[PDB]
Amino acid sequence: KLSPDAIPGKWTSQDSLLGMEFSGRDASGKRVMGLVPAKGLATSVLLSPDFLWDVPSNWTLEEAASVPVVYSTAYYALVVRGRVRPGETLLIHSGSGGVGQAAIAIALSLGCRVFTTVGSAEKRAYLQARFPQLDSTSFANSRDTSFEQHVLWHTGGKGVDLVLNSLAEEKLQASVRCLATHGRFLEIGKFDLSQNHPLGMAIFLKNVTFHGVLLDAFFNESSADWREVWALVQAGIRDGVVRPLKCTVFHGAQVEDAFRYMAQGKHIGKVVVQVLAEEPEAVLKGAKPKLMSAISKTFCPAHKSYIIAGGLGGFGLELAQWLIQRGVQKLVLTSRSGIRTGYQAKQVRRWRRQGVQVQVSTSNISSLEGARGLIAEAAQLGPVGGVFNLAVVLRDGLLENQTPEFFQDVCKPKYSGTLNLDRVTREACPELDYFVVFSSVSCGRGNAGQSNYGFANSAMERICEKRRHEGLPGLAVQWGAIGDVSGTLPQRMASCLEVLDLFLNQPHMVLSSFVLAE
Amino acid sequence: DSTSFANSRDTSFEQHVLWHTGGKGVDLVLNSLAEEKLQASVRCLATHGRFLEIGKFDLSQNHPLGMAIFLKNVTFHGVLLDAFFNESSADWREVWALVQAGIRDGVVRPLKCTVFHGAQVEDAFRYMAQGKHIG
Amino acid sequence: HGLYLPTRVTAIHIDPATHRQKLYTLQDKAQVADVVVSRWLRVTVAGGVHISGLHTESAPRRQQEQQV
Ligand SMILES: NC(=O)C1=CN([C@@H]2O[C@H](COP(=O)(O)OP(=O)(O)OC[C@H]3O[C@@H](n4cnc5c(N)ncnc54)[C@H](OP(=O)(O)O)[C@@H]3O)[C@@H](O)[C@H]2O)C=CC1
Numbered sequence: 001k002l003s004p005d006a007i008p009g010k011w012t013s014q015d016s017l018l019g020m021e022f023s024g025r026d027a028s029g030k031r032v033m034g035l036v037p038a039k040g041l042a043t044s045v046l047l048s049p050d051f052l053w054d055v056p057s058n059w060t061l062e063e064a065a066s067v068p069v070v071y072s073t074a075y076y077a078l079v080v081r082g083r084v085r086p087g088e089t090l091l092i093h094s095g096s097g098g099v100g101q102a103a104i105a106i107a108l109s110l111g112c113r114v115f116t117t118v119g120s121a122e123k124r125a126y127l128q129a130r131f132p133q134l135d136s137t138s139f140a141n142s143r144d145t146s147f148e149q150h151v152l153w154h155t156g157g158k159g160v161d162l163v164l165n166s167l168a169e170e171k172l173q174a175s176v177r178c179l180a181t182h183g184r185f186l187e188i189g190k191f192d193l194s195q196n197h198p199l200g201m202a203i204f205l206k207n208v209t210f211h212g213v214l215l216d217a218f219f220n221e222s223s224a225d226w227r228e229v230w231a232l233v234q235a236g237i238r239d240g241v242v243r244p245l246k247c248t249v250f251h252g253a254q255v256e257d258a259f260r261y262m263a264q265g266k267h268i269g270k271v272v273v274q275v276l277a278e279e280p281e282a283v284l285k286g287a288k289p290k291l292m293s294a295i296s297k298t299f300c301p302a303h304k305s306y307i308i309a310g311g312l313g314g315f316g317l318e319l320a321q322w323l324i325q326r327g328v329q330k331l332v333l334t335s336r337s338g339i340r341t342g343y344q345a346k347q348v349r350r351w352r353r354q355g356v357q358v359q360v361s362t363s364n365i366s367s368l369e370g371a372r373g374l375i376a377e378a379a380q381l382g383p384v385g386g387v388f389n390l391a392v393v394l395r396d397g398l399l400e401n402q403t404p405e406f407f408q409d410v411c412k413p414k415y416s417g418t419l420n421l422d423r424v425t426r427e428a429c430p431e432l433d434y435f436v437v438f439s440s441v442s443c444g445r446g447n448a449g450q451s452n453y454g455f456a457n458s459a460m461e462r463i464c465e466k467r468r469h470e471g472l473p474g475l476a477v478q479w480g481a482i483g484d485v486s487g488t489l490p491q492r493m494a495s496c497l498e499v500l501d502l503f504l505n506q507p508h509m510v511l512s513s514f515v516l517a518e
Numbered sequence: 519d520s521t522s523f524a525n526s527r528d529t530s531f532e533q534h535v536l537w538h539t540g541g542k543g544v545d546l547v548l549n550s551l552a553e554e555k556l557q558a559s560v561r562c563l564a565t566h567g568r569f570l571e572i573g574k575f576d577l578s579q580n581h582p583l584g585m586a587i588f589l590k591n592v593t594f595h596g597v598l599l600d601a602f603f604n605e606s607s608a609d610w611r612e613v614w615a616l617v618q619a620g621i622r623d624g625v626v627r628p629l630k631c632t633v634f635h636g637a638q639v640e641d642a643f644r645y646m647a648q649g650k651h652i653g
Numbered sequence: 654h655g656l657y658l659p660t661r662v663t664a665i666h667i668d669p670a671t672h673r674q675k676l677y678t679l680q681d682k683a684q685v686a687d688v689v690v691s692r693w694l695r696v697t698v699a700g701g702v703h704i705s706g707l708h709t710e711s712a713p714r715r716q717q718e719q720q721v
């Protein structure tokens with residue numbers, strides 16, 4: 001229901017955007033509960049210390065998993081934006097929900113009169129148990145617009161000072177009518193805001209401050225303003241106001257069950273996932289989290305350098321874009337003519353602006369000295385991590401019109417280049433962990449009139465097989481027809497990159513991929 | 519400075535502010551204009567902006583306001599000074615203190631004044647009605 | 654990244670007379686209209702068309718994945 005890009009901050013990760021809070025151990029073994037823009041549901045997280053509280057002694061790590069997001073948003077909404085003062089009467093929607101409970105806890109501490117809207121009778125009873133200060137006249141129905149009349153009755157018709165609205169459509173309009181003179185309306189939802197629904201300005205004749213609250217802004221900007229909310233949450237924790245919510249603990253192996261349980265919408269409190277059990281020790285100063293079985297997907301370090309021969313070509317640019325998304329920050333792209341088109345210039349400038357240390361070169365891998373120069377440049381950037389070989393020269397024609405010169409030209413970029421790269425990589429590339437060369441289905445199946453292409457591709461496969469036998473990385477991928485950049489319909493670039501992600505992890509040597517016509 | 523002026527009878531201040539502010543906008547806006555120009559002013563708010571409305575025409579007529587602006591942390595304020603005369607004196611003392619502090623600190627300067635005698639009250643009303651007065 | 658479709662446009666102004674005036678013939682027989690996008694001012698101008706306040710929302714892929 002929500003596009004991943006809607007999350008603030010240009011992530012582009014295309015995955016791992018499913019978490020917001022956690023409670024675990026710091027690198028020193030300290031018990032900490034944190035707040036992260038994304039990538040929360042994981043066995044580890046990389047968070048700045050400005051988003052990490054300390055779990056007190058009473059709390060258990062299970063309880064601490066609920067406080068951060070809910071209490072941060074409640075505090076930022078009320079204290080820092082609504083400037084709530086003691087004695088006021090504020091309306092908080094969806095009391096059972098986490099933010100509702102946090103807001104109720106904050107308000108009652110100051111002394112306010114609280115109106116809450118719940119969904120059923122069980123939630124009403126639970127909230128009565130939690131907060132004895134709430135009377136029977138402090139509840140309404142949240143599934144209809146009848147809370148308007150209730151609040152307008154028990155308030156004498158004067159309304160309320162604050163409205164922590166989280167409902168949409170007609171119910172939002174009803175909440176606005178409950179406001180009082182000098183009122184303050186705090187919108188934490190994102191549906192009516194997104195749809196650009198109209199809001200009658202007549203309400204402002206009465207002094208009204210219609211706020212729009214998005215806590216997600218702080219995570220990526222406005223670091224100066226954050227420390228106010230952090231100080232407020234810490235003060236609440238030490239003073240006793242901030243109380244952990246109810247939790248329903250699921251295990252890591254059953255996360256889908258937790259998601260479905262949430263989707264049913266029958267949870268009162270918070271739903272939590274137990275990635276790893278808490279030890280009885282106060283400070284375990286452990287080494288690593290327990291290992292688990294996870295689907296494999298490729299990533300790259302930052303100190304490694306990567307080389308793409310013929311990277312300025314069609315497939316080369318898309319593969320380079322893919323690699324950058326996986327952490328590559330030092331690249332070498334080889335072409336005989338360098339940059340000569342607009343698309344190449346656009347891509348290289350974009351990557352340089354992103355921070356990557358791109359560097360085009362004219363070191364023709366066909367000549368062994370050129371291969372040594374290329375590897376030397378890559379080293380100058382940093383240790384050579386991987387080498388890709390996407391060079392090709394095409395001189396097609398039936399064997400009748402073929403000549404030895406055409407064979408030599410077609411096989412120089414691919415046959416000779418791969419050999420030179422292999423020799424140099426063995427000589428002076430000890431940290432290399434990828435060696436990929438791109439072949440064509442013609443090598444296996446045989447496409448009429450591409451004999452030299454077949455011979456060049458077939459050689460590249462033997463070198464890769466031999467490398468993998470001696471314990472070294474090696475892989476020859478046999479592609480069909482790449483579409484965006486035989487009886488095999490072309491292939492989209494996205495599908496090709498997904499298949500490549502699959503291939504780099506397999507233990508085999510030569511793998512192929514194509515799409516069957518009809 | 520010379521780059522800080524625009525035109526108040528046209529919707530062109532939108533482009534001027536956006537260009538000179540780098541496309542970000544203005545953090546705080548004090549608006550006293552009509553419908554099209556109010557909409558123009560709203561499009562000038564930056565993230566974490568604030569909109570101070572002192573006019574009445576749009577508020578009285580209940581013109582629609584798009585709620586998409588609040589995706590940013592914009593805060594919309596309806597400022598009416600009359601509320602103090604009827605209640606909230608304890609709050610009015612804060613503004614009183616602000617004005618007194620400004621006066622004693624020299625920030626508060628008197629405006630340029632045009633004087634009409636008591637017998638000529640009608641002429642004063644006509645002159646202000648024309649709209650050429652400054653001060 | 655991903656495909657984005659228009660959802661809202663704050664204002665579009667079209668003036669065919671000025672449009673015909675703006676057009677200028679290329680060296681080939683084809684006619685061309687220059688275009689400028691000012692992402693700061695949220696305005697796109699080409700010939701006699703003036704689009705302002707264009708809003709595009711991400712659209713989920715149809716995931717037909719016809720290619721397997
Ligand atoms: N300003 C911001 O950017 C932030 C936004 N928020 C918003 O605050 C609100 C509270 O979030 P959270 O604490 O997670 O609340 P929960 O998801 O735990 O509960 C929300 C409430 O909505 C009602 N509801 C009915 N059906 C469902 C359902 N299927 N799933 C969820 N709720 C349901 C219930 O209240 P009822 O009993 O009345 O039916 C429920 O308690 C949300 O709208 C959230 O988007 C939160 C933090 C930051």
Ligand SMILES: NC(=O)C1=CN([C@@H]2O[C@H](COP(=O)(O)OP(=O)(O)OC[C@H]3O[C@@H](n4cnc5c(N)ncnc54)[C@H](OP(=O)(O)O)[C@@H]3O)[C@@H](O)[C@H]2O)C=CC1
Binds near residue numbers: 311315
């Ligand atoms: N995409 C496809 O349809 C399929 C292609 N393949 C293989 O996968 C790769 C895909 O790249 P592709 O789209 O063909 O690329 P291009 O069609 O753009 O051509 C190859 C690229 O490598 C460069 N190159 C060619 N020869 C040399 C050389 N001797 N030294 C340095 N650079 C060189 C070219 O630039 P310049 O000309 O300036 O040197 C160009 O950028 C190729 O290796 C191809 O053989 C196989 C199966 C399917």
